[PDB]
Symmetry: C2
Subunit: 71 residues, 2 copies
């Protein structure tokens, strides 16, 4: 009577193979990336803000240093 | 006869709910993150190498500029 669900039984098992291999491996990667997703941000976003300071300063500094840079 | 597989039939369907919702959503995130994983790297790794140059230069530049910075 419930023979179609039996036909789906062999279908489920093989269909899940694509899922268990995918979702799990994914989670491992998402676990890995999450570490650097946060860690990179700080050193990145802060160093950009910190970079403009060094940039403008040095950018003018360089034009003056080419005149007298410990000379 | 194959009644146990029928018992597993109702088990498969409900077990896959946790997978289809997980793996797929994951893939969407991994698709998203992949864009920034590469994009951040360049601006990050290169700006670090570029930062040491600006750092040392300005670091000495600042000590000289406090003597004469367009004065």
């Amino acid at each position: 009577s419930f023979d179609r669900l039996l036909a789906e039984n062999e279908s489920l098992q093989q269909k899940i193979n694509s899922l268990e291999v995918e979702a799990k491996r994914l989670q491992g990667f998402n676990e890995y990336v999450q570490e650097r997703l946060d860690r990179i941000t700080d050193d990145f976003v802060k160093m950009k803000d910190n970079f403009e300071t060094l940039r403008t300063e040095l950018s003018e500094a360089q034009q003056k240093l080419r005149r007298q840079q410990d000379n």
